[PDB]
Design a protein around this nucleic acid. Structure first.
Lengths: 387, 387, 387, 48
RNA sequence: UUUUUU
RNA sequence: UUUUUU
RNA sequence: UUUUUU
């Protein structure tokens, strides 16, 4: 097989190509230090190389009440090492200021003077879990962009307020504070991974913050991987016997698209139980799953998927997938109509029952037209906002 | 076999024909030294024989936080040695100036006076990882040339800015700074290999810079090797049973082209998991894969590939592949039309489903004509810019 | 077999009939000495018996950073000895002038006064690797002659400038400097062999100069041995089952030509992995492969090859191969036409597919006529330049 | 060339311009067997 | 003596 | 020498 | 680069 040359360097074995060591502090006033960290986040000051340390401090405070040794024995730390990420316990005796935690060295003097410039206020009420839940609110639609993330965050804040779960400070609702939090989450990997791990792997015991985190992790599944969802749910049909390819996916080019897409999916499934969050966590083979490696397959799959759900009509694409998308949409609409009225007879039903079901199917179809057209109008409003 | 005489000296065994030793420095202020290195890069001063040392210093700072011993035990250093490239740890006690690192010797006095001429500024914010990601931005379309590389770099900077991942200094956006970075990357092998290794082999844990590097490595796959892609995806067709040769590739000359191309591909696949980056890294048997050893096969394969994807219509060729390229393009367009309407009947489908699918295939064909013509017009604009 | 008497003295066993010893110097300022060597090359002064010493010094500086002991343990030195070529390490304590390296003796006083006449300039920027790459530029088309070599050198300098790989001094671009470099390469064997060895056997790690050297070595394959290429690719056809002789090669004389040519090819393949560079390196049985031992076979093979590639129409021959060359060219053109339209039916194809392929084959044939006629016109221009 | 161009006109009239259909036509079947044959030669560009 | 393109 | 899109 | 709803 010389066609293996095309797949060289895609699904490589696991090797560690880095060495990162995040200092974790065994202190007495863990809550007080975490409040200081939240306050420096609120101040807008960027954390240089200490973002990992302080955000992992917040995560350890939330999950383990402030005992970093338990975290070093946790499965999250077990996963992170083996990818080159390690943690040090350093006992701190007295911590009067947040600058005691950061050590002396090059480029830490630059941060230390700024942090000593900030004047904190003692006994802040905001806990680390509150910040972790607020940060988790950003995980859905984070790969989409800043504004979409902020819009989803405001919506989900409303939702969680009307459940009575949480009460975020009104200064967190500001646009700028969300700007700084979005930047902090986007750049930092360990915070996102820890949020994902605690959301996924907590079987019970959720407090308000854990409930919010788990909900946002569940909503973050396959964010940035709509191509995987559309292809695997519609184009690669799943039958009782085997796997049929969609009627619209018979083109000679689309067959090659399918084989390459499969190879990329073997690459993705190597990140077991973390593949849904690959684009969020920027895992290895996520660039192998893109719109542009698979133009025909992407447009056709999204068009076929749009023909079923009225909400997928709001998905935007580049200039070059639009026409093939709606061509596939109308093709699949007509095919679904034909399949609709074709297998009623295959079921044993009276004239009366089939008659009622035909009325129901027509009614459902018009409801779907209502909804798809409404979503299209809302999307047109969104683009008009962009204009 | 006397025909083996033609293949003598092509796929030779692995032997080490060189001895290179890059000094790596175990220092205290690794970040400070790396900032000095980035500043001397920004100054435009060319690094004579120390480019390898300082760029590997930047890579060690990024990957291993500044511990070169871990790098000497890394698999990248394991690969490099055995190709004749070794590293020395030399502990430096005090480093007040960047000139302390470079040792006394012939032709180093020339560089030392220039580096002492430059006046640095303390506490530069730019980290080594930022420079590594910016340098990685150049890897796609680096073998193409300087302007195409710079254009891709600007595009990808825009893309990475709108994700919120990174924020490059505005002085890096200048044309001249990209000129110096392009020159530095083009001449230096170890920097490119280290970027390729960290992009390929990092399974998880990506920060912003690692995400950018991995994305650009994934985009750099088979850059400069479009002939391999076109031939192996279209001319050497892959069936369930065996390997069919394309109908357009039956000529007696093209058969010899195919055998020679195969031999070159056994040469290429010897660089396992690095064959995609052969032209970038200038590996052994990459000159055996060229347009000019395989004129008929190159033109025919690119023409056949252009008949499928609308984006491949933008690929330029020499004066002598153009006519055969479009001849093959029209031949494959007509053949794909005939195959298109020929295997609809081979599938069990109703009159209705086949009718809908024929409408879909026609619609797809006109979309493809739109896109190919647009790409051709854009290419005409590009040549007009050249004029 | 009395016909063995004709082959006596052609494929003889390996014996050493010489004793050459090149002094190699273990010095401190290897780069400084190599710059002096490059400057004496630039001065145009001919090197008497020291050309081998200084050029091997440059090669050792390039490959091994200046440690000749590593070179003496290198496989290139292993190959050279056993052919009668050895090296001495002589440690030099202080080298203020290039004349310190050359020892006192007969005919070295003549060179020493001239080298002391030349006034060097300290700290020359030109490295040994740059000179080695520039010298390697001459290897393709070196056996052809001086002007063709210089033309190829200028073309390849342009090519390597537009890649951004290298920047040769503008004083090297002069015609006279290329004259001196051509003479130096032509006379000297060890320089050419070392360039060939490093180009062939370096699997990875190429810097700019190594990339240039490897490219020119790959382009130098079978330079001066077009007869081997033409015969083995066309006249001695390679089938799945066995070896067919070309229809044009059935003459009773051409059969003897084929047997003698085979014997010469067993002679050539004895130089394993170096047979492609036999005429360049003037290996043992290269005079047994000539135009003049095989007049009929040479002319017929080149004519048959010209019928396939449009570029081989530019190959010149003596007064006496021309008419047989074009006679074979037209014979093979008609035969290829007949074979062309004869095996379309042998493949299972529709009327439509065969029709399209016939259009494609006609279009390809007219493109080939365009290209062959253009090459013929360019060749006519070349002869007019000679006139 | 009178035969060539007039048969070109006849092929254009009867078969819309596809000479292969004419070579499979019964008129061409009759003509050959009387010694009259036709060659398809594809022309790429015809400005004159 | 070699003659092309790479 | 490479030439597209990613 | 991602673009929906959750």
């Amino acid at each position: 097989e010389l066609h293996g040359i095309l797949s060289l360097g895609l699904n490589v074995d696991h090797t560690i190509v880095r060495k990162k060591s995040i200092p974790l502090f065994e202190i007495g006033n863990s809550d007080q230090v975490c409040n200081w960290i939240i306050q420096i986040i609120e101040a807008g000051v960027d954390l240089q190389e200490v973002a990992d340390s302080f955000l992992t401090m917040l995560c350890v405070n939330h999950a383990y009440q402030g005992d970093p040794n338990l975290f070093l024995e946790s499965p999250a730390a077990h996963y992170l090492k083996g990818h080159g990420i390690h943690f040090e316990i350093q006992h701190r005796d007295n911590v009067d200021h947040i600058t005691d935690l950061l050590g002396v060295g090059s480029r830490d003097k630059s941060l230390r003077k700024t942090l000593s410039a900030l004047e904190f206020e003692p006994g802040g009420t905001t806990t680390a879990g509150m910040f972790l839940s607020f940060a988790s609110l950003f995980l859905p639609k984070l790969v989409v962009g800043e504004r979409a993330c902020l819009e989803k965050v405001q919506r989900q804040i409303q939702i969680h307020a009307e459940q009575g779960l949480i009460q975020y400070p009104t200064q967190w609702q500001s646009v700028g504070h969300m700007m700084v939090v979005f930047r902090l989450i986007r750049v930092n990997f360990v915070l996102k991974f820890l949020l994902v791990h605690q959301g996924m792997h907590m079987m019970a015991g959720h407090d308000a913050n854990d409930a919010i985190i788990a909900n946002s992790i569940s909503q973050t599944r396959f964010s940035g991987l709509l191509i995987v969802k559309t292809v695997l749910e519609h184009i690669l049909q799943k039958t009782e016997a085997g796997v049929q390819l969609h009627p619209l996916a018979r083109t000679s080019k689309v067959k090659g698209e399918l084989l390459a897409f499969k190879s990329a999916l073997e690459a993705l499934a190597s990140h077991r139980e973390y593949a849904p969050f690959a684009r969020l966590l920027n895992l290895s083979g996520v660039n192998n799953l893109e719109h542009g490696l698979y133009p025909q397959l992407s447009a056709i799959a999204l068009g076929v998927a749009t023909a079923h759900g009225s909400t997928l009509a709001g998905v935007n694409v580049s200039e070059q997938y639009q026409q093939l998308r709606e061509a596939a949409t109308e093709a699949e609409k007509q095919l679904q109509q034909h399949s609709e009225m074709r297998e009623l007879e295959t079921l044993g039903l009276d004239e009366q029952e089939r008659k009622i079901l035909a009325t129901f199917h027509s009614r459902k179809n018009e409801i779907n037209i209502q909804q798809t057209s409404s979503i299209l109008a809302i999307r047109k409003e969104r683009l008009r906002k962009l204009t």
